[PDB]
């Protein structure tokens, strides 16, 4: 109650000043739930789906890629994300194939930071399939 | 001064006039696009700034 | 001091309103429509009523275009444009004013639409 | 701290890769909006 939820891509806007009681965000260092008076933090995101529960009967299943959640002192949040798409624009069939090919290059990485780049890529496709 | 001098200077400010009319309609249709694309990028720009004012 | 003050201030305002539509037709063509004020939307609407009320079917063309040729006296033309300027017949649509005689036959053509 | 930390990376270098994978899992219809953003146009000029 008496909350404000803002959800904006760089090119488009989903929510402006319209809050619905519960926001589920995948944090880099875990996960949380916004109880509309949550103790305020400054967190950053991991690849994972955002399921905003509208009042409105049902929920809203978005899927962010990397953004920033700023819940602040007054009861108001500002969730800004880079690639915030829904579910139906994605195809599951291409997401299955992209996993094991990046696992195949993981053994074939000679350097230490180039192999660390491969570990970033397999994590994002892992949250891709399990969200589907 | 002469008639050959007046005509050549007169034609040259016809081409400069016609080109700056063409370059007004081009850079005005680039303006209406940049006005529509600003309003989604305004609140996303305002919201990322909004943490520092409440501190 | 030649045609009197009744002819004058009617025909003066017609050429002034026909200039404002000539200056506002460029912002609408380049920028767009809805940005201009509500006091200017009537001047756009009235000046398309005036420049179609200047049309008139001639008696020399009765065979071809099929309409009736109208000969308007002087006291009808001054009475007509004295009312279009004041917003007195503005709620009627545009095609009631196209190719009529006096202002009396204008409202007799709004009834036949739909 | 993670594997992209302590190996010498930045969070933009993290955010470039995980957002690039979402633009590869899109369909043929919404591939143009992945071509739309595609922000590789700024050149690099350092004097040395």
User: Chain B residues with CB inside 8 Å of A70's CB?
Assistant: 47, 50-51
| Candidate from B40, B50, B54 with C-beta closest to A12 | B40
Q: Are C62 and C99 in contact (CB under 8 A)?
A: no
Same domain, A86 and A96: no
CA distance A86 to chain B (A): 18
CA dihedral A17, A20, A21, A25 (to 10 degrees): -90
DSSP β-ladder status, A23-27 and A67-71: unpaired
Q: What residue numbers bound the domain in which A120 lies?
A: 91-132
CB D19 within 8 A of CB D39: no
Tallying the residues shown for chain A, one arrives at 132
* Same domain as A16, residue A63: yes
B41, B43, B54 ranked by CB distance to A6: nearest: B43
Do both A63 and A25 map to the same domain?
Answer: yes
**In this complex, do B40 and A73 lie within 8 Å of one another by their Cβ atoms?**
no
Long-range contacts for B27-33 (Cβ within 8 Å, ≥24 apart)?
B28/C30, B28/C31, B32/C31, B32/C32
Question: Which residue ranges form the domains of chain D, and what is each CATH number?
Answer: 1-48 (1.10.1620.20)
Residue in D5, D12, D22, D31 to test binding to A, most A beta-carbons within 10 Å: D22
Q: A104: which 2 tokens?
A: 């195949």
Is residue A51 within 8 Å of A62, Cβ to Cβ? yes
Which domains can be identified in chain C, with CATH numbers? Answer: 1-114 (1.10.1140.10)
Inter-chain CB proximity B41 and A9 less than 8 Å: no
Q: The domain that contains A132 carries what CATH number?
A: 1.20.5.440
Q: Experimental method for this entry?
A: cryo-EM
What is the biggest distance separating any 2 CA atoms in chain C, rounded to whole angstroms?
A: 47
For residue C31, the distance in angstroms to the closest alpha carbon of chain B comes to: 8
Contact A86, D33 (CB under 8 A): no
H or E element that contains A59: strand A59-64
Q: Are C21 and C93 in contact (CB under 8 A)?
A: no
Which residue does chain C place closest to B33, by CA atoms? Answer: C31
Q: Are residues A62 and A97 in the same domain?
A: no
Distance of CA B1 to the CA centre of its chain: 37
Residue A59: give its domain's CATH number: 2.60.15.10
Total structural domains within chain A: 2
Q: Which of A6, A12, A72 sits opposite B54 (nearest CB)?
A: A72
> Quick check: C30 contacting B, CB < 8 Å?
yes
Neighbouring residues of B2: CB distance < 8 A, sequence distance ≥ 6: none
Residues A78 and A97 in one domain: no
**How far is C44 from chain B, CA to nearest CA, in Å?**
23
Residue A80 Cα, gap to closest chain D Cα (Å): 14
DSSP for residue A25: E
Same domain for A96 and A126, yes or no, is: yes
Same domain? For A69 and A95 the reply is no
Examine the domain organization and report whether A56 and A120 are in the same domain: no
The tokens describing C48, both together, are 């398309």
Q: Are D24 and A94 in contact (CB under 8 A)?
A: yes
Mutate which of B39, B44, B45 to test chain A, going by most A C-beta atoms within 10 A?
B44
Which phi and psi (to 5°) does residue C45 adopt? -75, -40
Examine the domain organization and report whether A53 and A108 are in the same domain: no
- Please tell me whether residues A96 and A84 are part of one structural domain: no
Q: A86 and A49, same structural domain? A: yes
The helix-helix angle for D11-20 and A114-131 (nearest 10°) equals: 50
The 10 Å Cβ neighbour count of residue C103 is 20
Q: Report chain B residues whose CB lies below 8 A from the CB of C35.
A: none
Find out whether C64 is annotated in a ligand binding site.
yes
Contact call for A94 and D17, based on CB within 8 A: no
> Is residue A55 located within the same domain as residue A86?
yes
């Amino acid at each position: 109650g008496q909350m404000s939820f803002t959800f904006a891509s760089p090119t488009q806007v989903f929510f402006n000043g319209a809050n619905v009681r519960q926001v589920d965000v995948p944090t880099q260092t875990g996960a949380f739930g916004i109880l509309a008076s949550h103790v305020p933090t400054l967190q950053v995101l991991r690849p994972g789906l955002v399921v905003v529960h509208a009042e409105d009967g049902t929920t809203s299943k978005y899927f962010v890629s990397s953004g920033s959640v700023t819940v602040n002192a007054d009861s108001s949040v500002q969730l800004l994300a880079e690639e915030a798409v829904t579910l139906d624009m994605l195809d599951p069939g291409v997401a299955k194939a992209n996993l094991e090919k990046a696992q195949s290059e993981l053994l074939g990485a000679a350097d230490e930071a180039s192999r660390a780049e491969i570990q970033i890529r397999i994590e994002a496709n892992e949250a891709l399939v399990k969200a589907l | 001064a002469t008639l050959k001098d007046i005509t050549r200077r007169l034609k040259s400010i016809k081409n400069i006039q016609k080109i700056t009319k063409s370059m007004k309609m081009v850079a005005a249709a680039k303006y209406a696009r940049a006005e529509r694309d600003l309003k989604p990028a305004r609140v996303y720009g305002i919201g990322s700034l909004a943490l520092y004012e409440k501190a | 001091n030649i045609v009197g003050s009744e002819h004058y201030d009617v025909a003066r305002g017609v050429q002034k309103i026909l200039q404002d539509y000539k200056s506002l037709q460029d912002i609408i063509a380049i920028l767009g429509m809805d940005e201009l004020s509500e006091e200017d939307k009537l001047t756009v609407s009235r000046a398309r009523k005036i420049q179609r009320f200047l049309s008139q079917p001639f008696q020399v063309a009765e065979v071809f275009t099929g309409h009736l040729g109208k000969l308007v006296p002087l006291k009808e033309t001054i009475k007509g444009f004295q009312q279009i300027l004041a917003g007195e017949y503005d709620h009627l649509p545009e095609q009631a004013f196209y190719m009529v005689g006096p202002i009396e036959e204008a409202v007799a053509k709004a009834d036949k639409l739909a | 701290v993670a594997y992209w930390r302590q190996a010498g990376l930045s969070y933009i270098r993290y955010s470039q890769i995980c957002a690039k994978a979402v633009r590869d899992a899109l369909k043929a219809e919404f591939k143009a909006n992945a071509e739309k953003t595609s922000g590789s146009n700024v050149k690099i000029v350092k004097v040395k």
